[PDB]
């Protein structure tokens, strides 16, 4: 029983809900494709677009093996402008502790309560951020652990869904404004969510 995989499963399920909600509250896609649902006993917005949904799944299916090995330092949803310059970065800083502690109080109910606080802070974030310019798109970037083995080929999990090294153009954000969202420390996960935004 590999609890690092248990943690990776919780993260990918959460990261899907989070990416969906980010695309909603940042209006990256039209509001019509989104449906109001409840996850972690908290209101969320899931897109019903089949190919957008498959794109997020393929991305996270690829990230998951790296999460299972604790080889991921950041998962970043980056929002591009019409000219492909980054406007905002939604940085999910992730690290499992050196030894995971699995309590039988309730592993699940309390990590989900902690993740629920992340969902609520995302919802209200469009009262602090400036409205993005029209025609924005998004991208997911994965920062791998300092010493990680051949991650470029471990992340190629989905057929015909390749990965690449990002450019400096994909990440360039000189002197941004920092918007902390939520920080959790559990006996299975330390996660930081904050937003960098173009000055």
């Amino acid at each position: 029983l590999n609890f690092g995989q248990v943690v990776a499963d919780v993260l990918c399920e959460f990261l899907e809900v989070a990416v969906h909600l980010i695309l909603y509250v940042r209006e990256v896609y039209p509001v019509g494709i989104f449906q109001k649902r409840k996850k972690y006993n908290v209101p969320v917005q899931m897109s019903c677009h089949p190919e957008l949904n498959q794109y997020i799944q393929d991305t996270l299916h690829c990230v998951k093996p790296l999460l299972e090995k604790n080889d991921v330092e950041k998962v970043v949803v980056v929002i591009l402008d019409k000219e492909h310059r980054p406007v905002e970065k939604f940085v999910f800083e992730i690290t499992q502790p050196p030894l995971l502690s699995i309590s039988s109080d309730s592993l699940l109910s309390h990590v989900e309560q902690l993740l629920a606080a992340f969902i609520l802070k995302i919802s209200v974030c469009d009262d602090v951020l400036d409205h993005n310019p029209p025609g924005c798109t998004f991208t997911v970037l994965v920062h791998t652990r300092e010493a990680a083995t051949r991650n470029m080929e471990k992340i190629q999990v989905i057929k015909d869904f390749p990965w690449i090294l990002a450019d400096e153009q994909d990440v360039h954000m000189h002197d941004p404004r920092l918007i902390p969202l939520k920080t959790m420390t559990s006996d299975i996960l330390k996660m930081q969510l904050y937003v960098e935004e173009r000055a």
Partner: peptide
């Protein structure tokens, strides 16, 4: 310097969005 998908997310036309709103709730 991080990793990214080489494939870009789909572009969803307003027509597709209306269809998604209309037929996939």
């Amino acid at each position: 310097l991080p990793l990214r998908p080489k494939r870009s997310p789909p572009v969803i036309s307003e027509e597709a969005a209306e269809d998604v709103k209309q037929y996939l709730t």
